Design a protein around this ligand. Structure first.
Ligand SMILES: Cn1ccc(CNC[C@@]2(C(=O)Nc3cncc4ccccc34)CCOc3ccc(Cl)cc32)n1
Ligand SMILES: Cn1ccc(CNC[C@@]2(C(=O)Nc3cncc4ccccc34)CCOc3ccc(Cl)cc32)n1
Lengths: 306, 305
């Protein structure tokens, strides 16, 4: 019992964090096998940040310009290439702590753990979600660039995010491990703004099923709704539309609790109308949207608390 | 920018997690040097848990009865002893991944990271606080016993908690690494209940300073209060008393934000009597009490491990 915002154990990722210095810029790199991945803006000179020509800046660099530090050992860079917004530094030593890994690009609503690093050293781990506006609400100070997001499902690390920038609202933008940004963002200091964010509806529903599995039923009601009527209400509270994919994904939780998805949808509509009235759901006075249906099944038991 | 509930990196602790099986019971153990620490209730069965004489149950056990598994390698138990509610299994091999460590007992209000494990395998890490009623609001399923709580100070892991049980309200109870329970709990199948909990006041204030550092100032007001007047109000809302040591601990955050501790206390007092009025602080409609003053400084300054 109990429901917490839980991150994956970060050990497999800690053994990959290195410091990458290029001139006056220092940030984090991900050392996997004989390659160090990091944001390509490590080659920028702050002035360059507005309209950098990364191909032009990279061509002027030599291997010895990149100082890579793994603990108290300096790695030797023997090659460098750029793939989208990520810089790939070939090093002369394979990381002996390289775990089984994959590079996965995630969709909005997906959650992952972030290992926040400064100077190649891990300082904290937290759980986050890719917002529908493609930003993450992280906790990142200057020097955190190159910090990664990941999931650890069954001994394999799926790297899904690398931190690159903070937008003016305090939210964060980054890329997958192939250098493609999530969202309409660019690694330039040009005026950029996060679009209006919305609540991840399928995740809220998954968290309402977690609350039911944990013995909380106060918010349930005798009503059902159509998928279209639910979406018409949801859009008015800046909630993402719920698709038939989402309804299908919620199927296992619906079967385990005995509450049809559209029944839980009607309970959500009522919560949006009434608020909580001084009550909490899983220790929260707001509807939580950073737990996917997969996270709820993973964390919760296979026996509901009737 | 940003403020998250953040746990310490768990790598140093993951390299210590092992599986301990005794009869039909399987749980987690902490392998440090040549000793494996685990809850002593691993020696119990269905009848034994009801009224256990752990000295009597342990004397009947031999070293080969304890199956310890570190990854896919079985460790050989060469000795066993009990210290309070923790079982210490001496093994033939020192854990080569043993970090620099200490066993520390924490006080209510102090926070720590929990590495939740099942079958000696880490599955999640979360941040939690020792509640004033000595329970933790954790997330544990059957098989999580032996999962540990820790903090990191520099390169040293301070182990402060080992999970033993779940109370009927869904909250959790455990011991320090010397086997002394936090709270008036016992490791037996018997009627036990968590006492009425209270809010950790110094931690709420620390989280209000984190909100100010992050640009959330709506709750600030021109007022200040005495420590005596604030404590009268705090007691009325089931908030822990704020001491002069708490005021001193909040000093650095008071200096950085320009809001004196009793100035932030008047702001907390108004929040208690009037609520948030549909507003949020750091994305929360409730006052968060699981960030200590040290956690706030650590996260709003970037200390690494
Ligand atoms: C010269 N240089 C190289 C690396 C850096 C490091 N700054 C890069 C920068 C950025 O967003 N950095 C930060 C990232 N995350 C949290 C932060 C918290 C506080 C301050 C800065 C943060 C700032 C300038 O605006 C941009 C535009 C685009 C991009 Cl991709 C990156 C940035 N500076
Ligand atoms: C010997 N053994 C077999 C299985 C177990 C493990 N159960 C020990 C037990 C306990 O509290 N276990 C649990 C701990 N955390 C989360 C849980 C979620 C679901 C079910 C059980 C959980 C059972 C109840 O009664 C008590 C009394 C006292 C003590 Cl110290 C321990 C326990 N131990």
């Amino acid at each position: 019992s109990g429901f917490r915002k839980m991150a994956f154990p970060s050990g497999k990722v800690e053994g990959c964090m290195v410091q990458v210095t290029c001139g006056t810029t220092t940030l984090n790199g991900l050392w996997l096998d004989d390659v160090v991945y990091c944001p390509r803006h490590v080659i920028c000179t702050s002035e360059d940040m507005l309209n950098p020509n990364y191909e032009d800046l990279l061509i002027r660099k030599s291997n010895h310009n990149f100082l890579v530090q793994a603990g108290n050992v300096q790695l030797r860079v023997i090659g460098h290439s750029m793939q989208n917004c990520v810089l790939k530094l070939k090093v002369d030593t394979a990381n002996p702590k390289t775990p089984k890994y994959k590079f996965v690009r995630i969709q909005p609503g997906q959650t992952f753990s972030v290992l926040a690093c400064y100077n190649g050293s891990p300082s904290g781990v937290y759980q986050c979600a890719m917002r529908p506006n493609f930003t993450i609400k992280g906790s990142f100070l200057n020097g955190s660039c190159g910090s990664v997001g990941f999931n650890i499902d069954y001994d394999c690390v799926s790297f899904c995010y690398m931190h690159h920038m903070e937008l003016p609202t305090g939210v964060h933008a980054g890329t997958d491990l192939e250098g493609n940004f999530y969202g309409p963002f660019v690694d330039r200091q040009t005026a950029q703004a996060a679009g209006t964010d919305t609540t991840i509806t399928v995740n809220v529903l998954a968290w309402l099923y977690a609350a039911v599995i944990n013995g909380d039923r106060w918010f349930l009601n005798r009503f059902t709704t159509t998928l279209n009527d639910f979406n018409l209400v949801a859009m008015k509270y800046n909630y993402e539309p719920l698709t038939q994919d989402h309804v299908d994904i919620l199927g296992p939780l619906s079967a385990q609790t005995g509450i049809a998805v559209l029944d839980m949808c009607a309970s959500l509509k009522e919560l949006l109308q009434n608020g909580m009235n001084g009550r909490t759901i899983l220790g929260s006075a707001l509807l939580e949207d950073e737990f996917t249906p997969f996270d709820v099944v993973r964390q919760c038991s296979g026996v509901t608390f009737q």
